Symmetry: C5
Subunit: 312 residues, 5 copies
């Protein structure tokens, strides 16, 4: 119920450690994700060291109350974690052992500049206040950090789960503080995004382009306009995707380029028909023959330039 | 335990300051948002002066029980805040330092009259419970008011976070109760809205307008009606994100004007065809030539007038 | 604590009053509806006044576990309300003043007929638990009943807020009549709904009607059928901002009438083309010239009749 | 706080009853519905004895935690009910008048074979356990079962609310239990479903059929294909209805029939055009004339057969 | 209160059994499902005994709090289960029976690689908190396991519910802890999927394929492009009821193949028209005649190959 007293001036060190169990429900628009894991703490307290020979036992057990557990809080959580203690043990020399299970929802920003092929890093922070006149510092136990082989996040791949051993210390509300950082690195599985999204747009665009090999005005108008309507519907079907961003991403630029191409195609069809009506078939034929080759080459060049810009 | 007597015959002033940590879940339908922040208080009570040199200068850590803590309640909260005491400290002169941490849901109105380019303001209200013997008033501490640099809202950029005073006896209640006000000014990042919404709408409108350079009735009818269908689909896509509001905004006026323009274009096409059939081609040609320049100028003038009306 | 003892067989009257704050969160399909508001009691406590003296004329402020607080329950709440007392003032004489802030999910019937121009009435029912002493009666307190002039019920303008003691009985008791009924009459602001829904529908219908000034079968077919498709898409858009109503409605009647008009227009166009093919141009011209005038007049007459029928 | 001392070897019995207040949120996706109601129980215990000799009283309330109460639990519920004791009393002979209000969400299967015109039955199950050596069985008090005139469910009609007097004892987990059954019979209101769903589809089908009075191939193709697209869009709009079911429903069969009719119409139009091209106009005219009368008759016969098959 | 003495050679063995009552709310995006079932335990403790002699008529005894209870914790469960003790019984010889009732949420992987015709498996994991003095391992009781006949899942049928023993020393910790696996095998009822999904899409494709029996370019382009739009709308309808799957499934392959077929059909129509324009009708006729037979055969072959690749 009382913090240990310092011998001369030394602070107290607490050894932490987090062991993941499962990550799920990674919301894109809300920029949150849920998690449940094991939390382990250990600290040394000489005031409760007992006699092993006299008592005949090596390690004594206890109960969650009536003993000094340091407070540990999470910075970026919407609500306090739901907790239940699993074990408390005391070593002969005084060091304490602890274990608990918790579940919480974390807040972390995301970067969507390369949304189909992006990589993200999620941060978890642990913080402890300088209680009483004893300074409290945090340490990382490298043997108590890990994850289960059954930890699966849908559509994501897990690369590493480490902790920055060196903490960050500063003064907040006229009191010293220490903050620990846990980093989880993930990479998106982009294979499914190709056949379900990318290729149908190309097919519809080529269907639009196929109108340069024709002369009838009504057929060309029907083709181009119905293809544009189909593109709008596909954009509606795709909109279940990244939220509004302060920057320009890859997919947004591609979609805008597609809209521009549709507008230019409509302009070309109108120009060709207007020239044909004015009894100048040669100019219309030259224009359509030029456009036949001009359109795909410009599309490929613009796509290459965009890929250079966003990945170079 | 007991209220501090007014031996000095002075009002019991406090020093209140809120330090933010992060804000999240700014709902539009329910007109509310969540918060997670500290709360620091400081008041003078000479009943527990601690001049002697018993223990260090930080003569402190009285438990939350067996001590008089002024009770502070929020006003515009859906549910009572959750509280957890962090520090309780006493200076030898007589002032007592106190701190907490809380999470709550705050209700505050929003005004989407300029939805793409609007700025909002969020209010937090503070009230102290009076005491029969003495009097309590509020005050703000400039140093203790601030926010972390890690605060973020999805789509909003924070500008300022200040505190102002509001005189007492709010509403019909007049039990000498003073209240405080906290304002968080925010803006909306409106860059991404341009290439996502505005430009495709103009492209579709221009595609529809291209019908004035033709004389085929069937092609013109197909162009105009199919572009109207595309306009309706894009309206569905736009409304998917825009929160519902029971009043008139900027985007609603723009959409209504677009519908009106489509109706007028259909009327013009019908008039041109009917005049042409009656063996009066000169009048039809003159009408379409006039409309070619009439439509964009009127559209630009209407947009300018609307912009001046809503933003001035 | 204990309830006040009988004095001269005088029943205990409780003057109640609700001070509205917020009316928001219209959840589900217009069945559940959240309320945040204050709540005021005033029951005399004669022959038990605490420290009554002119030397102690200062207003007495007490704690909830210090005086007898009557128990009041809401009849139609999904779950028991979350009580939160703001402050308690006890006069030296035999009277008390109570004020608390609550939040509950209230269930009330909503009628959506006359959906754009409807008025709603919300009822909340109050009963008070009886004790072994004399019967506790309920009465209205006119002074404390009212709003704060700044209720954030968006889209609705509040007309009045009154209360009546309606005699009722549910299961079994001598009186059981101690029930209060507070009614909050509200009305909807329908101005935005006109340009949001009504006018585009008429524009589309007129665009469909433009086919009577033509003689091209292909043009008429394209016009009418594509306009029908646009009408279906606009209906899909309209159904989003509207709850599920399992009963007839003004808007539903209008939509059905529009569908019938489209069907009749298709029939007329087919008949005209068939006659023209069978070489009866005079009959075809007479039919179309009659329809040009017949359609809008019947539309207006049906609309007038429907409005008169639905709106008394 | 112990079970009653058995005055004999007879099994202790408890008679109960449920009084409904409101039924709402009859979800069909998860086959659930919410409800709140009064629960009334009564038993006998010689531990409590009144004092008619000591001038008597008539109510003499108590508090729930002070007396033994049998544990009543519901079988098919989401979680434990939210029960707050409203009134508990006693009598000179020693009968306890228990009355609590509870809210819960119930699980019950639904049958959707006649979805537009279907009637269902909902079940609530009560259960008790054999405590100590004293066996406990349940009884039904017909005076405490019923619903008030204010019980309304949106879009449904209430028929009856009864309880089977005879329980169904069984041995589970080496113990004997008794179960009570409460049934609530409801019937759907179907009038609003006709002009909202049934008739527009018939109008679209007739618009598709009107293509047998023409000879132009392009107009027929446009009519049939655009009507098919409109039917698909209407199905998209209507899809907010009954979920996936193991069996086959009425509306699903009707929709499949409509799809078959559309396919047959396309085949007929193509065959007629192919015959017309091949310089055999007489056969094409005969086929069209036959189909004109063959389509509606087959549609009517199929509808009659389906009606006899499902509702007969 | 105290752990059992380690007298026997074998560690303490508990007999666990789960009796399902019902399951519900199977969410697929988060891959969770809630449960409601029993929990029956048993073990032998020789510390206390009840001799049949000396008024040993009482075979069974009840200890609410004055007895040692092994505690069971769930692993793949989002929040701690809500359990309430039902009954505790003690045999005269020493064997102790124990029962509860719980309800919680479960996290389990899902595999939608055969979405219409897939079978899943739901897991529940149980662990025991080791005691210092003695040792505990789990065991299964086949007569304490099972499910009630009133269990139901909307769209599934239950095959079996069995249990097995998982190896000790799970995860990184090796503190002689054992785990229990409860297997629930279900299958998806797919009868309603055929006439709701598969047949309409085939009908639309067959309608589109009729363009090979015509020579009119306008009719061909109208048919193909409008059927493409209809396919996109039907894809929206199909996806509406499908949870998001960030991988490649059977239905996605089918849809992509349909898109490819539409693109090839457009190319063929364009080639036929272009060849006909240059006065080479024999080659165009040969091409269309070949395509008439080529398309269905290739479609069937691709379908067979996909079926063998995914279900073999
Ligand atoms: C804002 C204003 C945008 C207005 C929206 C409608 C744009 C339609 C553009 C006009 C259609 C094509 C014009 C046309 O047929 O011109 C043919 C005419 C040739 O006829 P002569 O024999 O020389 O006489 O001139 C041309 O060839 C013009 C070719 C390029 C014109 C189009 C360039 C872009 C138009 C403005 C886009 C604004 C964004
Ligand atoms: C409401 C119902 C609206 C139906 C759609 C109206 C369509 C108008 C077409 C009429 C038309 O083509 O008239 C051409 C007509 C032919 O004149 P002659 O007698 O040949 O000389 O010319 C005119 O009248 C000149 C143009 C005036 C058109 C004004 C239309 C206004 C419509 C307002 C609708 C509200
Ligand atoms: C505002 C930009 C769009 C409108 C531009 C004004 C239209 C000019 C115009 O009508 O010129 C027509 C004139 C020839 O048509 P007639 O007068 O019949 O010979 O020239 C054109 O076609 C202009 C083409 C370029 C238009 C660009 C848009
Ligand atoms: C249900 C609605 C059924 C149709 C109601 C309207 C009928 C209009 C045409 C009435 C007869 C008529 O005018 O005959 C014209 C002419 C033939 O008469 P002659 O001898 O050539 O002169 O008939 C037509 O123009 C036929 C028009 C076909 C359209 C009607 C069919 C619509 C599709 C079938 C609907 C079946 C509903 C059951
Ligand atoms: C041009 C056509 C489109 C605009 C139609 C609406 C015009 C303005 C509607 C004015 C509504 C109004 O007066 O207030 C609402 C008023 C109040 O309802 P009660 O109290 O029952 O009315 C009795 C005393 N009047 O309701 C009405 O009168 C509604 C009138 C509906 C008119 C037709 C609207 C639909 C047209 C399509
Ligand atoms: C459903 C009834 C469908 C029409 C059956 C009668 C019919 O074939 O009418 C056609 C009839 C005779 O023309 P032939 O086919 O050359 O003989 O002409 C018409 O279209 C008459 C009008 C029929 C209206 C049908 C309304 C339903
Ligand atoms: C599954 C595979 C089929 C994929 C989709 C195929 C659609 C093609 C349907 C037939 C188009 C029209 C054929 C045509 O013009 O035939 C006319 C031709 C007339 O000339 P003859 O003297 O017979 O030489 O033959 C006929 O009359 C054919 C009559 C029956 C044709 C329709 C049969 C049903 C089609 C089966 C579709 C699959 C089920
Ligand atoms: C991946 C892209 C796949 C599509 C690329 C084109 C494949 C389809 C063309 C197959 C036939 C080509 C030659 C042929 O027989 O065409 C005849 C004729 C000329 O040949 P002669 O020498 O006269 O004989 O050509 C045509 O008819 C041309 C038709 C073009 C249709 C394809 C247009 C595709 C649209 C642009 C796609 C760009 C992809 C990058
Ligand atoms: C597989 C079923 C659909 C394809 C059937 C094979 C194609 C038959 C065919 O081409 O027959 C055409 C032939 C006449 O056309 P020409 O070759 O010009 O003589 O006969 C037909 O039209 C038969 C069509 C029957 C289709 C039934 C499906």
């Amino acid at each position: 119920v009382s913090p240990p007293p310092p011998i001369a001036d030394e602070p107290l060190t607490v050894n932490t450690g987090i062991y993941l169990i499962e990550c799920y429900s990674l919301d894109d628009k809300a920029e949150t994700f849920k998690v449940n894991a094991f939390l382990s703490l250990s600290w040394k307290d000489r005031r409760l060291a007992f006699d092993p020979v006299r008592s005949g036992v090596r390690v004594k057990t206890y109960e969650p109350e009536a003993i000094w557990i340091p407070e540990i809080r999470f910075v970026n959580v919407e609500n306090a974690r739901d907790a239940d203690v699993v074990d408390i043990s005391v070593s002969p020399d005084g060091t304490v052992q602890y274990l608990e299970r918790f579940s919480a929802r974390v807040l972390s920003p995301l970067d969507f500049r390369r949304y189909p092929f992006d990589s993200q890093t999620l941060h978890i922070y642990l913080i402890v206040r300088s209680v009483d006149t004893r300074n409290i510092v945090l340490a990382v136990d490298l043997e108590k950090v890990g994850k289960n082989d059954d930890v699966f996040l849908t559509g994501w791949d897990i690369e590493s789960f480490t902790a920055v051993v060196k903490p960050a210390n500063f003064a907040l509300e006229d009191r010293l503080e220490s903050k620990l950082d846990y980093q989880l690195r993930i990479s998106r599985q982009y294979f499914s995004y190709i056949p379900n999204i990318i290729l149908p747009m190309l097919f519809i665009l080529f269907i639009s382009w196929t109108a340069f090999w024709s002369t009838s005005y009504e057929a060309n108008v029907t083709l181009v306009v119905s293809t544009l309507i189909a593109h709008i519907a596909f954009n509606i079907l795709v909109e279940t995707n990244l939220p509004k961003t302060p920057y320009m991403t890859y997919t947004g630029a591609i979609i805008f380029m597609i809209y521009l191409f549709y507008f230019v195609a409509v302009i070309e069809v109108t120009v060709q028909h207007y020239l044909k009506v004015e009894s100048q078939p040669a100019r219309a034929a030259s224009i359509t023959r030029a456009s036949r080759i001009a359109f795909p080459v410009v599309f490929l060049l613009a796509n290459i330039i965009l890929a250079f810009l966003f990945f170079g």
